[PDB]
Design a protein around this ligand. Structure first.
Ligand SMILES: CCCCCCCCCCCCC/C=C/[C@@H](O)[C@@H](N)COP(=O)(O)O
Length: 162
């Protein structure tokens, strides 16, 4: 260990490049309780799009549960003025920071809320090379987030409109 943690900033375009679909690959956190929300998940496809009011972004997803069910979700994020952090509507305690990852099609989030933090790994590919997952696990372990979750991604993605 020692960060090679590299921030992606939107205070400085980031939006246009990151539009479209992303897959949830893995999470890491100080303990398992703060990842357990993902235990029933087989896979998740997300779609990010521009918002319709200043500083807003639309995030949509469909979650494939391990029991085969498809569950639509949506959130509205807000870019904090003069900051690299994002807020999420309806969750006043929550903050998200974005980081580059070792793999080309990847992106890493750190989420914090009341009492917890977690790192979350996404990729443009639903099945990125195993090296991407390993590098994520190593980076986060060194940052003291040693509890780990890998999404199994054994089922098909659910439908999510463009
Ligand atoms: C707006 C993000 C800016 C980055 C845009 C490009 C990258 C997008 C990658 C996908 C990010 C998905 C983040 C969502 C995570 C949720 O699963 C958790 N917050 C749980 O939410 P819960 O189910 O508890 O509500």
């Amino acid at each position: 260990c020692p960060s090679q943690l590299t921030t992606l900033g939107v205070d400085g375009e980031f939006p246009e490049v990151h539009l479209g679909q992303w897959y949830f690959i893995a999470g890491a956190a100080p303990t398992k309780e703060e990842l357990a929300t993902f235990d029933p998940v087989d896979n998740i496809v997300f779609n990010m799009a521009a918002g319709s009011a200043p500083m807003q972004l639309h995030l949509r997803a469909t979650i494939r549960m391990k029991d085969g069910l498809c569950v639509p979700r949506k959130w509205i994020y807000h870019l904090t003025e003069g900051s690299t952090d994002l807020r999420t509507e309806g969750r006043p305690d929550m903050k998200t920071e974005l980081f580059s990852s070792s793999c080309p099609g990847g992106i890493m989030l750190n989420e914090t809320g009341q009492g917890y933090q977690r790192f979350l790994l996404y990729n443009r590919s639903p099945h990125p090379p195993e090296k991407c997952v390993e590098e994520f696990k190593s980076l986060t372990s060194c940052l003291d987030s040693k509890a780990f979750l890998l999404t199994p991604r054994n089922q098909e993605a659910c439908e999510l409109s463009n």
